[PDB]
Amino acid sequence: MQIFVKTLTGKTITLEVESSDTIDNVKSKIQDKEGIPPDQQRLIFAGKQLEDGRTLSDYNIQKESTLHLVLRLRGG
Amino acid sequence: GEIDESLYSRQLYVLGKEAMLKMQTSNVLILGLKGLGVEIAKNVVLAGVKSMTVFDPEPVQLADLSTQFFLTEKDIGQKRGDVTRAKLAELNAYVPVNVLDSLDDVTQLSQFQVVVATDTVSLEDKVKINEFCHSSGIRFISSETRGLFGNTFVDLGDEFTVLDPTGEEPRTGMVSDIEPDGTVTMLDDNRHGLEDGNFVRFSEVEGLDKLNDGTLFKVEVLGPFAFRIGSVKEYGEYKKGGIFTEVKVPRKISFKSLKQQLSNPEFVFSDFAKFDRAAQLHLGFQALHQFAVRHNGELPRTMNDEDANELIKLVTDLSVQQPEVLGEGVDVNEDLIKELSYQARGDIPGVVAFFGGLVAQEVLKACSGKFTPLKQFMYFDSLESLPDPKNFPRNEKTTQPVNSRYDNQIAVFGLDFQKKIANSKVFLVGSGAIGCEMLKNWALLGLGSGSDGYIVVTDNDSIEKSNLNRQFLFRPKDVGKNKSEVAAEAVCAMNPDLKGKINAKIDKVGPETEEIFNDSFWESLDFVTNALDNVDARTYVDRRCVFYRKPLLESGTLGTKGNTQVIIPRLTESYSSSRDPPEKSIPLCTLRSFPNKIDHTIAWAKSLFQGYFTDSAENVNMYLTQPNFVEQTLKQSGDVKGVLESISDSLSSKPHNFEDCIKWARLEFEKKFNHDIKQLLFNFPKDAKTSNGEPFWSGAKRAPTPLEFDIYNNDHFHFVVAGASLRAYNYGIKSDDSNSKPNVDEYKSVIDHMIIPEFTPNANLKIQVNDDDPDPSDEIDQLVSSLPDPSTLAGFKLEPVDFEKDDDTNHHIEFITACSNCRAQNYFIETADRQKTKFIAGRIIPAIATTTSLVTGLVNLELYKLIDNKTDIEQYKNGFVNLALPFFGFSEPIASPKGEYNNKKYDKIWDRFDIKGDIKLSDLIEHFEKDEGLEITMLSYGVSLLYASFFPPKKLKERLNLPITQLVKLVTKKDIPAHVSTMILEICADDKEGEDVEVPFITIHL
């Protein structure tokens, strides 16, 4: 299936995945596309931050779901 | 066409000159000056629009003070508009603020480009005003807050052009091939970073010449390293070279009217976990108005059941009339609507701040076409903020007005909870942008105004002019004073309940101030809130919060982007548990020899600046005042030869007047932009080839060309002026009654009489090509014998330059800009202006008040959760925003990782072993085996090993009988300072089966 990853700068990434896939996996597909190491990636979906152990099923991620890749900022 | 950079500097890096120029031709009208209206207005006036006009002829009442920080009790009975006007005016001298007396004549709306309708304006009147606006090209925005709920609606008309959807730097990149079908391959491993449907232009593409003419090409992304632009065989055939630059094209969009949208709304979601709620609230908000029509302007009574059921029924009727909002077979969420009724009169600071920031930014979008507007409705709630009714019962008695400014907060949370807020003890780290907003919010909460409460705020910085653009507590007359102190005073004028309750300190947090910010200070607090501008500080506060077990409310911004995080004792990860992307380093060879971007020439120039005017001076002063210096340098410097040449040159040259400084700077121009370039070219001529026979100067290596000084060139001229002026300052030489602007003809007569020595190559010099390949005593002895004896120069001092990005008269950015651009000319890189150079060299963070208030609002809604000591992680919200998009999303915090040793479960972040007193080593080891089932294997204080189970008997007899303080003295040869009240010890240990197991750390309480 396809899912979408929207970044905090408005970029849209498309991914080919399976709900059996791990978050670890998804992070590495994101690494392939954007060059961002997995340990720097914050993915959120439907009120939860996705964690390394789990699967796409564990967060209930359907086809054409959008996940958000977000950041923390240093200004203040 | 003129923008005050000294005021607007940081906002300008967010919005841009064009957007701000349109903003300054836009007249804005705000209807309603309760909290929401005044928050929106504050932000828009700070941002700088041609004029702000406010309308609100209703008398001030005590309850209006819940969120309207510019009303005082003395204002009661007078009109909101009139009383607020002057205080908004003081925020920005460039923006007049007027009061519209009467809006009986809707025709008056024609004077304005953007009209905003807040919570004070009826729905019936909103639809009328919107129809007037929409049909005559006036941009319309509305917003309403009701308790912990809120919305906003945007209608920019039938024709609106978005000029830039995101505000991001255009992508850019180097190209290595373009095939006939249009497939564009990036150079090496560089990522183009484009998205399908982006547009790009090209330059330097050899063999396709009309492809460089400015034509745009639509992008088809193939992978991370290639995109396609459509056939190019009609333009020629690619040879080499090429740089693509992304272009944002304009986009025309249409809005519907408020009326059309009431029954077919287009939603943007505030939180995707809550999406099924937007339609329901959309019904509910309309119902509050129907309700008011039937009850003579009045909203539902606070916590009242009869009225809530009336609202539930009004909503039910509405879903029949607007079948399209819920859709087919979706029931009215009755509990939601009941809460909306219950809270309809609530005026909550955090929610007002959230909408005030958001809606202010939509106003700026509407004036400018910068950023993507909200299209068209957004609804929001923060219901998770409600305390557990077990601890704080909510009902008609507890929530009733008490005749105080807090009555409409009480309306939601109840009196006892509001009193608990007043008795909180809080530390605020920072009094800048977040800091000022935070203290305003706290003033409105009455936080710390109870006899058991207080606020401490610390910040060592003083108020600079650009601060005034987003630190709304400061005035032009406060410039130079201390932020924390002025801020504290300002918020007491806003709410006198805090008079005497804010301790404003001028200390920086960190390891050096732990005597001030000590055990007793920290243990006394309920929680800590950050308001900081860098990561190391946030990390330090996070560590202390872990150690003292205090919650921490974290936030941050960068332009339109922002985030919130909560760190809760014994529940979540801490700030330092996770990593953020680090700043990418430029390779050394790229800076030194092969720059291809202005970022590179700026870094180079900044460093030359340091060396010329700061480092070389500091060195000379050390050498003249430290009789061991030369000996000290030899053993300990990495670069010895450099330090000694910099002293030698600083003392032989020794100018006597300004004319000599001109000469030094001209010769520096020749060395840096002529000779060094000819040298690099001696080692690698234009046509030179690599090992495989490919051209050396390709891709990132751009073949330079030496400069012939030309005083009519701005960069050449300013290099000399700024370089001479700074040299002069180093040597204490008066600049030319320097109030005088520098004169071209004057400098030219000096430069024209100079003999500029010719370049001679050096065949010894080898230049480092890649960073991997390594490269660079009797000249040193020679260089020492050349140095003047220090008693030759008695009382001679050089004055080092302390870099200051924000003084336009001091020559610093003048120099770096000119020095950068001269090297840019060398390498055919586009030169940059002072603003851009200042942004890069000065590491300036883009910043605006809208994002700052919104994010602060979000923090103050998590704050409510701490007051209730919530232990259910599912209740807390880390937030992420970009107002440019606009985007809001939230996530439940991550749990602290847990461990186990033996049968004991522990928190890997938060748990420790607390030991009372200066315990003896043997007693400690024994306590752990007897009480914890742990055989200590290794025990350490910082860097130093105090005990290890492999220690043989002689060594153990030395240590086992020592208290920990003495054990440290034995090992580190160093005392424990008097003031130190705790010591952290790390341990490794084996469990009851003799296996190594990860365990908590130990705190020794002395």
Ligand SMILES: *NS(=O)(=O)OC[C@H]1C[C@@H](Nc2ccnc3cc(-c4cccc(SC(F)(F)F)c4)nn23)[C@H](O)[C@@H]1O
């Ligand atoms: N975003 S803003 O408008 O620029 O305002 C930000 C505030 C925060 C201030 N900085 C500040 C205030 C109080 N204490 C500290 C400590 C530090 C700091 C900075 C760098 C390194 C270190 S040492 C370490 F990491 F703690 F070990 C400490 N910054 N503090 C500004 O003054 C501004 O007003």
Ligand SMILES: [Cl-]
């Ligand atoms: Cl109303």
Ligand SMILES: [Cl-]
């Ligand atoms: Cl921009």
